[PDB]
């Protein structure tokens, strides 16, 4: 909400009027050069429908005294009346007023101004450029076709205004039979205005595209000099289009590059030894997944790190705080302190049949599995049978990090599973803050090892109570 | 496994039929625009061979009722004679139908709508579109060398239909002598269709490739306007080709200019340290070999590098088990033990006349020969003294690691070999975990020690019967 | 500091002289080829303004004896005339000398060697190549643009000298009517040098750009051969421009199409978790801000994080110390920890109207407000009663983060603010290692709580009097 | 050494003869199309100097019977003559022979073969392609100029053989005044051979570059059809050159591109806040070293990752084994055991003022400093003054890894230093293999503590005697 009698620039009513002036700009982008080159007085069929547009643009220059502008240093939308004006007047108000006087006025001060005056209205093209500069940054718009539509209007405009100048040079020549157009057609000054405009637009397009048939070409020095600069412009413009379409091509298929070679090199190597298909599908299943889970990890990690911990601690508080109470070890801890743990649990992804935590782990971190099924196995004499199959809700690596011993087992994954992480020194640093809970997680830690009837890991239970001793 | 009287889209005969239809589609892509331009009423030598193609496409638009379609929702061939029919009839049945009426019919409703009508049967180009779409997502075909063939086809097609349209503009004109072609050749209406077609195609390709000799060019506004749009099209099209062949080139050279980047780094590293030249070459003799055989696909270790040890060993076992079972050392042991023994070995190739394990050295590793051949040789009073050669499928330096005697004889690779490596430590930290079986290894070589009967070959007896008393 | 009567090449009064000699080089880059082609003997309007430029280059010939030069092995400005001279005299002193003799001298040895002689003084073009060589490594210049500006001058120079050579081939020809220019204009030898120079410059550029209208073209073999090489040169040159403009474009758009990859990833990530739309709002309100302000250069944290915490802290102390010493609770404490207390704070910008710390929230953090303004407001009875606003240079949420009471109020950023964060833990594990200074914080808070005279703000009085009881 | 009367393909005396035939190939690459196009019988001034080349190539046919070839499957140089022949005779011997017969022979077979026969010699062009394929993947040659030289010869060849065909079409026309060349030159069939060759070479070059002046252009149907295919070839060829020069440009500034942005982002941010130049360069004097080190570290790791251990263990055994006897801890260990440690000591680089190992860290690894000056510090309640400084030959992290204790001190790098590395479990699995040495490295570090005289040093020795318990 803003002050009375002020419209915000982001209003939808407004932004649907702004996009309507752009079609009026494409209109003057055509008519202004065409009048400059082909006309000398405001003839009716175009004077009428040009004083109209000079009202829709007069309406606008007053309708930006009631339009707030987003301040930049404070990102506030200014709605101070006497401050909007002083910014307008200081920036554009002069031009936008000058480029709206009807041509019939400038005619009265000097008959020789119709052409040049109407060329001032090309100042309105600043709205087209401001529009394109916004669409590329938008996300609901294909960056390809937006970058292509801007290349089209640029080259359609240069082709058109060049044709209008190069005809002007021939029209205001002293005697016309020595012009570039007077060479072919005898009396081009009597031909229809549609023929003349098509001819010059056709010379212009075949010089820009470097076809250069050579039927129409400069004949005297005035024309040769304009052409020298036109042909130079096109050399840069052409190199600019080719450079822009290469970048739209080699940077549109720039990801699938190092994902096909590998898949190729995979089955390539596979068929150099024609090993059975029962595993062909098995490995490529992992090749694609491990490409997925790292893309997902990378994207999530990058967006999560670019946010303040006052907000990122609301995502990691909305995704996990529910299943952070079913963990057997945190049952009974103060509700607030648990918030501090959930705020710091970097969720990592994992492709199936991979080892998250291996035997004799240096005590670094313990995980929490939010979804998927992981299975437990220990190493002994080189034969390893499954121990347990932990699924969503339980904790693994939980002991060795607490009692500062090497981790006792090794966890593997069966499906692509997502796991939380918790470095030891952080989780350790958190408890010494609120020590009023640091005892509670210790007993229900122990009550865990007693609620289980496993004999050889309750072995790992008695030597810790002499650690208590 | 589909119901009777239904054909799977993945059948073999069906795919050869589809390719046949694509060939016919190319035929119509040439002939439909050509009739629009250069012909006015169906004359025999084409009015026959197009009715034939119409018959074939009618056959297809009827037998596409007996073809099942996959579904991203299930990835399953939906073989029911109701959903198939209602997918076809709904999607584009009537288009493929209307693009099959013989022109000898449309002539009987309006003698004018002949060229424009049989211009309708360019709708068949959807089949070429689909063919290229499938060829892209494949792996026996170079993706860029297909994105490029699709561009040469679209280029040829544009060059062709532009020529036909332009000649049509010229022919329909009232006064023939004010046309682009009537300016050069006087009675262009009395020349062979061959000459007129070649002339117009000649103008068309000259303008598209921006040569523009200027002998043939527009003469009136009707032609200038067509040409304004043709030249605009080409500007975008050639900008699109150059963008696409830049892509093809970047990836065609990526490999050979990656190789020269590692060889560069392998010297920028061996220089900072002033490595001796005797040693600065063995490095490059192994990086050259690595890429020269990396291209072969034999080198392939990346696939194993990107795999978890859980799945990787499952396929490493598939290879070197049928070879390692014959080695005299591990003969007659538990299957589980030697299985993980396979898992902890790494392969490594060796250019010929190298030295994998030279004698009088610390017994650090022992190898398994998988391919190729090498040979033991003694440095006898500083002279080469060859010994028995070792073939593929045996063991090297095994006496050193399991007796800690320094290596007996050096080993030089005769040909380009490829061995399996297991160093002393990682082996010991396996056997002694389950010594219960490790004893079956000790006597195995011992029993093997009396298989050889030679003085120093029997010196292997006393030095293990040293630890009998030691 | 250097010796007497020596100028360092880095002098500022001197760089303005070198740059002056470049706009004189550009003069000879135009005049020397033009005289070769269109002129035969020095005529006044160009014979005087050409000896002038020869003076300013004779001056630089002596005034380069009093200029020190660097040395890659020393990076030092060697200033000893004996060693400076021999560097010049033996490198290219003579070339610069012979390219300064006035043409009125070489005239009086052989009247033929006029136009060819003053093509020698294109050797001065080395100064332009030197100039561009510096604008590369400069950092205040666009660099792709500098790579681009150098091709505009190359392609303008090639277009120019090609026009003067090609006219020379025509002027020297025996019969003038069989020349490329004599075929078009009859008496081309009786036209203004303006007309002839524009014509030949016109041909030269409809060939470089490959337009090739064909009005002016070679007529005899001597011209065809020059043109064969000109058209070959251009093929390489335009292929080199398009390669360089592709480089300029790829790097000019990288930013905008990187910001699009960030926002894209930030929506996919929100989409997989089905995040509530209220929260999907906040993220993109902070990523857009990050790239807009990142564009401003305030966001400057990427450079900050790269350095080691040992040096990174050295800068962070330089900024937020003069701000932090004013905070009330850090009053009168030893300068050691306030330095290390600063180093462990992280900055984070906040778009306006974003609630950074809401009411009755668990006391997790506490901030220091660097730039901007925010204000606390209470959620009472559903009416948002604003309280005194906080300015840039004070502390928020401090009572909660120490007395462990759920947050006193909310805080909404009025404008775009930027704060310093320090959570409860990382702070506490620092003070409790330095308890000897911690009470100085404890009493400062209370003493501060007495200077305030408020009903509930003095509940923090009685609220903490348990801390001395409990 | 190889068998008698056999030359290896790598012999210098031979590879200096192969590079001489290539200039004879560039000779036939010109003469053969020119004879096909402009001559109809072997005139002297070119028949003599063409039977010569057909001797230097006959000689070579003999010589490749005494030239070993690299057996790819075994990378050996084959030597048995009976095998060299059978590979030649089966691959190229026919063509290389059929393209050597002097043109005077084929003349006696049929007068009309002179043109076509001499075009067979273009088979010799296989040597040029084999040469370029070698120069590219060589290292002593600039990859840029090698790919530029290959693009020049291709276009110089297409331009030349197209000119020779397009003249053949005009020479063999029934009446000559209806040709592309007979249009301009009244009677071209009596002009010099140099004028005619320059004309057609000039038409060919304008069409290839798409200039197309239009003075010379197809006049009839056979010419139009040749041109349709020539102009099509050029469209692909031109797109191939532009694509090849973009790749040589945007892929030659590939590092340069990722590096300057970080540098300017520093100083521009530094000038954003105009902090003193004292430390302004100090940080800028680090990003370089940080970059200079990740590159060296990346490349050494890349080229040690590609070699067999039996060789990589000769580099590390040459760079470090000399200074791995001054370490106080390994003084007295058996010699061959020390070899095994030097084998697995991954050497890492480190920019200055960075911390290789930080306080209270679970035992993971201990390093060895080969060069540079590192300094030791400890976090005592946040006031860290240096304890000692270490230089080449001192070990750090030596304690925590050996007694399973959190790390005691924190090492910083007072300059750019290179550091060895040794993970705990690897170092542990090694002594467990030959325990005949574990006792003397276990204890000799204790004397190091008693050779140390610090009161707060033996505090960790103060549980070493119940470490005996
Ligand atoms: C030697 C010299 C060499 C010179 C060569 C340089 C090439 C010029 C490129 C300029 C350019 O890209 O503009 C830039 C400014 O922003 C724009 O993109 C402006 C938008 C164009 C407005 C015109 C459209 C009018 C509507 C059309 C109505 C048609 C009229 C009727 C037609 C029948 C864009 O830059 P970028 O986006 O960063 O890339
Ligand atoms: C087949 C054949 C193939 C031919 C292919 C040729 C293309 C490349 C040409 C060389 C080139 O690019 O420059 C190189 C640089 O080195 C220099 O050029 C040195 C300095 C040049 C200064 C230019 C003078 C401008 C004077 C202005 C006077 C204006 C007067 C105009 C009057 C109207 C290359 O650039 P790089 O990045 O160093 O690599
Ligand atoms: C639509 C149609 C599409 C058409 C597309 C055309 C593309 C053309 C590329 C061809 C090509 O490069 O082939 C290969 C290169 O070939 C070689 O390696 C041969 C090297 C040149 C041989 C000739 C030199 C003779 C000496 C000159 C003496 C001149 C004598 C006359 C001078 C007056 C590809 O190389 P790559 O990049 O590895 O892939
Ligand atoms: K052209
Ligand atoms: K032309
Ligand atoms: K062109």
Short mmCIF file of N, CA, C and O in Angstrom, two decimals, chain C residues 77-160:
data_model
loop_
_atom_site.label_atom_id
_atom_site.label_comp_id
_atom_site.label_asym_id
_atom_site.label_seq_id
_atom_site.Cartn_x
_atom_site.Cartn_y
_atom_site.Cartn_z
N UNK C 77 64.49 0.29 -12.60
CA UNK C 77 64.61 1.32 -13.61
C UNK C 77 66.08 1.66 -13.79
O UNK C 77 66.58 2.60 -13.16
N UNK C 78 66.76 0.91 -14.64
CA UNK C 78 68.18 1.09 -14.89
C UNK C 78 68.43 2.50 -15.40
O UNK C 78 67.97 2.86 -16.49
N UNK C 79 69.15 3.31 -14.63
CA UNK C 79 69.41 4.69 -15.00
C UNK C 79 70.92 4.94 -14.99
O UNK C 79 71.48 5.51 -14.06
N UNK C 80 71.57 4.53 -16.08
CA UNK C 80 72.96 4.89 -16.32
C UNK C 80 73.13 5.08 -17.82
O UNK C 80 72.99 4.13 -18.59
N UNK C 81 73.43 6.32 -18.22
CA UNK C 81 73.42 6.69 -19.63
C UNK C 81 74.24 5.73 -20.47
O UNK C 81 73.83 5.38 -21.58
N UNK C 82 75.38 5.28 -19.97
CA UNK C 82 76.20 4.34 -20.71
C UNK C 82 75.42 3.07 -21.03
O UNK C 82 75.50 2.54 -22.14
N UNK C 83 74.66 2.57 -20.06
CA UNK C 83 73.90 1.34 -20.29
C UNK C 83 72.58 1.59 -20.99
O UNK C 83 72.08 0.70 -21.68
N UNK C 84 71.99 2.78 -20.82
CA UNK C 84 70.75 3.09 -21.52
C UNK C 84 71.01 3.21 -23.02
O UNK C 84 70.30 2.63 -23.84
N UNK C 85 72.05 3.97 -23.38
CA UNK C 85 72.34 4.19 -24.79
C UNK C 85 72.55 2.88 -25.53
O UNK C 85 71.89 2.60 -26.53
N UNK C 86 73.47 2.05 -25.04
CA UNK C 86 73.80 0.82 -25.75
C UNK C 86 72.61 -0.10 -25.90
O UNK C 86 72.58 -0.92 -26.82
N UNK C 87 71.62 0.01 -25.01
CA UNK C 87 70.38 -0.72 -25.21
C UNK C 87 69.65 -0.21 -26.44
O UNK C 87 69.16 -1.00 -27.26
N UNK C 88 69.59 1.11 -26.60
CA UNK C 88 68.92 1.69 -27.76
C UNK C 88 69.75 1.52 -29.01
O UNK C 88 69.30 0.91 -29.99
N UNK C 89 70.98 2.04 -29.00
CA UNK C 89 71.83 2.06 -30.19
C UNK C 89 71.91 0.72 -30.87
O UNK C 89 72.07 0.65 -32.09
N UNK C 90 71.80 -0.36 -30.12
CA UNK C 90 71.96 -1.69 -30.69
C UNK C 90 70.64 -2.40 -30.93
O UNK C 90 70.65 -3.49 -31.52
N UNK C 91 69.52 -1.83 -30.51
CA UNK C 91 68.24 -2.53 -30.68
C UNK C 91 67.52 -2.09 -31.95
O UNK C 91 67.42 -2.86 -32.91
N UNK C 92 67.00 -0.86 -31.97
CA UNK C 92 66.48 -0.31 -33.21
C UNK C 92 66.63 1.20 -33.26
O UNK C 92 65.70 1.92 -33.62
N UNK C 93 67.80 1.72 -32.87
CA UNK C 93 68.00 3.15 -33.01
C UNK C 93 68.05 3.56 -34.47
O UNK C 93 67.54 4.62 -34.84
N UNK C 94 68.67 2.73 -35.31
CA UNK C 94 68.89 3.13 -36.69
C UNK C 94 67.59 3.15 -37.47
O UNK C 94 67.34 4.08 -38.25
N UNK C 95 66.75 2.13 -37.29
CA UNK C 95 65.45 2.12 -37.94
C UNK C 95 64.67 3.39 -37.66
O UNK C 95 64.18 4.05 -38.58
N UNK C 96 64.56 3.76 -36.39
CA UNK C 96 63.89 5.01 -36.05
C UNK C 96 64.61 6.20 -36.63
O UNK C 96 64.00 7.25 -36.81
N UNK C 97 65.90 6.08 -36.92
CA UNK C 97 66.61 7.21 -37.49
C UNK C 97 66.31 7.36 -38.97
O UNK C 97 65.89 8.43 -39.42
N UNK C 98 66.51 6.29 -39.75
CA UNK C 98 66.31 6.38 -41.19
C UNK C 98 64.88 6.73 -41.52
O UNK C 98 64.60 7.35 -42.55
N UNK C 99 63.94 6.38 -40.65
CA UNK C 99 62.54 6.70 -40.87
C UNK C 99 62.19 8.10 -40.40
O UNK C 99 61.03 8.38 -40.11
N UNK C 100 63.18 8.98 -40.30
CA UNK C 100 62.94 10.36 -39.94
C UNK C 100 63.58 11.34 -40.91
O UNK C 100 63.35 12.54 -40.78
N UNK C 101 64.34 10.86 -41.88
CA UNK C 101 64.96 11.76 -42.86
C UNK C 101 63.86 12.41 -43.69
O UNK C 101 62.93 11.72 -44.14
N UNK C 102 63.91 13.72 -43.92
CA UNK C 102 62.85 14.35 -44.70
C UNK C 102 62.90 13.89 -46.14
O UNK C 102 63.98 13.65 -46.70
N UNK C 103 61.73 13.76 -46.75
CA UNK C 103 61.67 13.31 -48.13
C UNK C 103 62.42 14.25 -49.06
O UNK C 103 62.97 13.81 -50.07
N UNK C 104 62.47 15.54 -48.72
CA UNK C 104 63.22 16.48 -49.54
C UNK C 104 64.70 16.16 -49.58
O UNK C 104 65.43 16.77 -50.36
N UNK C 105 65.16 15.22 -48.76
CA UNK C 105 66.54 14.76 -48.86
C UNK C 105 66.64 13.59 -49.83
O UNK C 105 67.35 13.67 -50.84
N UNK C 106 65.91 12.51 -49.55
CA UNK C 106 65.89 11.37 -50.46
C UNK C 106 65.46 11.76 -51.86
O UNK C 106 65.71 11.01 -52.81
N UNK C 107 64.81 12.91 -52.02
CA UNK C 107 64.56 13.42 -53.36
C UNK C 107 65.86 13.67 -54.10
O UNK C 107 66.01 13.28 -55.26
N UNK C 108 66.83 14.30 -53.44
CA UNK C 108 68.08 14.61 -54.11
C UNK C 108 69.09 13.49 -53.96
O UNK C 108 70.26 13.72 -53.65
N UNK C 109 68.65 12.25 -54.16
CA UNK C 109 69.55 11.16 -54.51
C UNK C 109 68.99 10.49 -55.75
O UNK C 109 69.72 10.18 -56.69
N UNK C 110 67.68 10.25 -55.76
CA UNK C 110 67.02 9.63 -56.90
C UNK C 110 65.57 10.07 -56.89
O UNK C 110 64.82 9.70 -55.98
N UNK C 111 65.16 10.83 -57.91
CA UNK C 111 63.81 11.35 -57.96
C UNK C 111 62.75 10.26 -58.04
O UNK C 111 61.56 10.57 -57.93
N UNK C 112 63.14 9.00 -58.22
CA UNK C 112 62.16 7.93 -58.28
C UNK C 112 61.77 7.46 -56.89
O UNK C 112 60.64 7.01 -56.68
N UNK C 113 62.68 7.56 -55.93
CA UNK C 113 62.49 6.92 -54.63
C UNK C 113 61.83 7.88 -53.64
O UNK C 113 62.31 8.10 -52.54
N UNK C 114 60.71 8.46 -54.06
CA UNK C 114 59.94 9.32 -53.18
C UNK C 114 58.81 8.55 -52.50
O UNK C 114 58.78 8.44 -51.28
N UNK C 115 57.88 8.02 -53.29
CA UNK C 115 56.76 7.33 -52.70
C UNK C 115 57.17 6.06 -51.99
O UNK C 115 56.53 5.65 -51.03
N UNK C 116 58.24 5.43 -52.45
CA UNK C 116 58.67 4.21 -51.79
C UNK C 116 59.42 4.52 -50.52
O UNK C 116 59.30 3.80 -49.53
N UNK C 117 60.20 5.60 -50.52
CA UNK C 117 60.93 5.98 -49.32
C UNK C 117 59.99 6.18 -48.15
O UNK C 117 60.09 5.49 -47.14
N UNK C 118 59.05 7.10 -48.28
CA UNK C 118 58.18 7.38 -47.16
C UNK C 118 57.12 6.32 -46.96
O UNK C 118 56.11 6.60 -46.34
N UNK C 119 57.31 5.13 -47.51
CA UNK C 119 56.67 3.96 -46.95
C UNK C 119 57.51 3.36 -45.84
O UNK C 119 56.99 2.57 -45.05
N UNK C 120 58.80 3.69 -45.78
CA UNK C 120 59.61 3.27 -44.66
C UNK C 120 59.03 3.77 -43.36
O UNK C 120 58.98 3.04 -42.36
N UNK C 121 58.55 5.01 -43.34
CA UNK C 121 58.07 5.52 -42.08
C UNK C 121 56.68 5.00 -41.82
O UNK C 121 55.79 5.73 -41.39
N UNK C 122 56.50 3.71 -42.04
CA UNK C 122 55.46 2.92 -41.41
C UNK C 122 56.05 2.08 -40.31
O UNK C 122 55.31 1.41 -39.59
N UNK C 123 57.37 2.10 -40.19
CA UNK C 123 58.04 1.49 -39.06
C UNK C 123 57.57 2.12 -37.76
O UNK C 123 57.58 1.47 -36.71
N UNK C 124 57.14 3.38 -37.81
CA UNK C 124 56.56 4.02 -36.64
C UNK C 124 55.34 3.29 -36.12
O UNK C 124 54.91 3.58 -35.00
N UNK C 125 54.77 2.37 -36.88
CA UNK C 125 53.59 1.67 -36.39
C UNK C 125 53.87 0.79 -35.20
O UNK C 125 52.93 0.30 -34.58
N UNK C 126 55.14 0.56 -34.87
CA UNK C 126 55.44 -0.23 -33.68
C UNK C 126 54.88 0.43 -32.43
O UNK C 126 54.53 -0.27 -31.46
N UNK C 127 54.77 1.75 -32.42
CA UNK C 127 54.26 2.44 -31.25
C UNK C 127 52.79 2.18 -31.02
O UNK C 127 52.34 2.26 -29.88
N UNK C 128 52.03 1.87 -32.06
CA UNK C 128 50.63 1.54 -31.85
C UNK C 128 50.50 0.14 -31.30
O UNK C 128 49.72 -0.11 -30.38
N UNK C 129 51.25 -0.81 -31.85
CA UNK C 129 51.24 -2.15 -31.30
C UNK C 129 51.70 -2.18 -29.86
O UNK C 129 51.21 -3.00 -29.08
N UNK C 130 52.62 -1.30 -29.49
CA UNK C 130 53.00 -1.20 -28.09
C UNK C 130 51.84 -0.69 -27.25
O UNK C 130 51.57 -1.21 -26.17
N UNK C 131 51.14 0.33 -27.74
CA UNK C 131 50.02 0.89 -27.00
C UNK C 131 48.97 -0.16 -26.69
O UNK C 131 48.56 -0.33 -25.54
N UNK C 132 48.52 -0.88 -27.71
CA UNK C 132 47.52 -1.92 -27.48
C UNK C 132 48.07 -3.00 -26.56
O UNK C 132 47.32 -3.60 -25.79
N UNK C 133 49.37 -3.26 -26.63
CA UNK C 133 49.96 -4.26 -25.75
C UNK C 133 49.80 -3.87 -24.29
O UNK C 133 49.74 -4.75 -23.42
N UNK C 134 49.74 -2.58 -23.99
CA UNK C 134 49.56 -2.17 -22.61
C UNK C 134 48.09 -2.15 -22.22
O UNK C 134 47.75 -2.53 -21.09
N UNK C 135 47.22 -1.73 -23.12
CA UNK C 135 45.80 -1.68 -22.78
C UNK C 135 45.23 -3.05 -22.49
O UNK C 135 44.16 -3.15 -21.88
N UNK C 136 45.89 -4.12 -22.93
CA UNK C 136 45.44 -5.45 -22.56
C UNK C 136 45.45 -5.62 -21.05
O UNK C 136 44.40 -5.73 -20.41
N UNK C 137 46.66 -5.74 -20.51
CA UNK C 137 46.83 -5.92 -19.06
C UNK C 137 46.64 -4.57 -18.40
O UNK C 137 47.63 -3.88 -18.18
N UNK C 138 45.41 -4.12 -18.22
CA UNK C 138 45.31 -2.81 -17.54
C UNK C 138 44.30 -2.84 -16.40
O UNK C 138 44.44 -2.00 -15.51
N UNK C 139 43.26 -3.64 -16.60
CA UNK C 139 42.08 -3.81 -15.74
C UNK C 139 41.09 -2.66 -15.79
O UNK C 139 39.99 -2.96 -15.55
N UNK C 140 41.40 -1.44 -16.16
CA UNK C 140 40.36 -0.38 -16.20
C UNK C 140 39.73 -0.37 -17.59
O UNK C 140 38.90 0.51 -17.84
N UNK C 141 40.12 -1.31 -18.44
CA UNK C 141 39.63 -1.38 -19.83
C UNK C 141 38.88 -2.68 -20.02
O UNK C 141 39.29 -3.70 -19.49
N UNK C 142 37.92 -2.66 -20.94
CA UNK C 142 36.98 -3.77 -21.17
C UNK C 142 37.70 -5.07 -21.55
O UNK C 142 37.10 -6.09 -21.33
N UNK C 143 38.84 -5.01 -22.24
CA UNK C 143 39.72 -6.13 -22.67
C UNK C 143 39.18 -6.94 -23.83
O UNK C 143 39.96 -7.33 -24.67
N UNK C 144 37.94 -7.39 -23.77
CA UNK C 144 37.42 -7.98 -25.02
C UNK C 144 37.25 -6.78 -25.95
O UNK C 144 37.72 -6.84 -27.06
N UNK C 145 36.74 -5.66 -25.44
CA UNK C 145 36.63 -4.45 -26.28
C UNK C 145 38.00 -4.03 -26.77
O UNK C 145 38.12 -3.69 -27.93
N UNK C 146 39.01 -4.06 -25.94
CA UNK C 146 40.33 -3.69 -26.49
C UNK C 146 40.74 -4.70 -27.55
O UNK C 146 41.28 -4.27 -28.50
N UNK C 147 40.44 -5.97 -27.35
CA UNK C 147 40.81 -6.94 -28.40
C UNK C 147 40.04 -6.56 -29.64
O UNK C 147 40.52 -6.81 -30.71
N UNK C 148 38.85 -6.02 -29.45
CA UNK C 148 37.98 -5.64 -30.59
C UNK C 148 38.45 -4.34 -31.23
O UNK C 148 38.62 -4.34 -32.43
N UNK C 149 38.84 -3.33 -30.46
CA UNK C 149 39.25 -2.03 -31.03
C UNK C 149 40.46 -2.20 -31.93
O UNK C 149 40.55 -1.52 -32.90
N UNK C 150 41.37 -3.08 -31.59
CA UNK C 150 42.57 -3.39 -32.38
C UNK C 150 42.21 -4.01 -33.72
O UNK C 150 43.07 -4.01 -34.55
N UNK C 151 41.07 -4.67 -33.87
CA UNK C 151 40.74 -5.23 -35.19
C UNK C 151 40.04 -4.17 -36.01
O UNK C 151 40.08 -4.25 -37.21
N UNK C 152 39.39 -3.22 -35.39
CA UNK C 152 38.82 -2.15 -36.20
C UNK C 152 39.92 -1.33 -36.84
O UNK C 152 39.80 -0.89 -37.98
N UNK C 153 41.02 -1.10 -36.12
CA UNK C 153 42.12 -0.37 -36.73
C UNK C 153 42.85 -1.22 -37.74
O UNK C 153 43.32 -0.69 -38.75
N UNK C 154 42.97 -2.52 -37.50
CA UNK C 154 43.62 -3.35 -38.50
C UNK C 154 42.78 -3.40 -39.77
O UNK C 154 43.31 -3.26 -40.87
N UNK C 155 41.48 -3.58 -39.63
CA UNK C 155 40.65 -3.68 -40.81
C UNK C 155 40.43 -2.33 -41.48
O UNK C 155 40.03 -2.30 -42.64
N UNK C 156 40.65 -1.23 -40.78
CA UNK C 156 40.59 0.06 -41.45
C UNK C 156 41.88 0.37 -42.15
O UNK C 156 41.89 1.07 -43.16
N UNK C 157 42.99 -0.13 -41.62
CA UNK C 157 44.26 0.07 -42.27
C UNK C 157 44.36 -0.77 -43.53
O UNK C 157 44.81 -0.28 -44.57
N UNK C 158 43.94 -2.03 -43.46
CA UNK C 158 43.99 -2.89 -44.63
C UNK C 158 43.11 -2.35 -45.74
O UNK C 158 43.51 -2.35 -46.91
N UNK C 159 41.91 -1.89 -45.41
CA UNK C 159 41.03 -1.29 -46.40
C UNK C 159 41.70 -0.09 -47.03
O UNK C 159 41.47 0.21 -48.20
N UNK C 160 42.55 0.60 -46.28
CA UNK C 160 43.12 1.83 -46.79
C UNK C 160 44.30 1.57 -47.71
O UNK C 160 44.33 2.08 -48.83
#
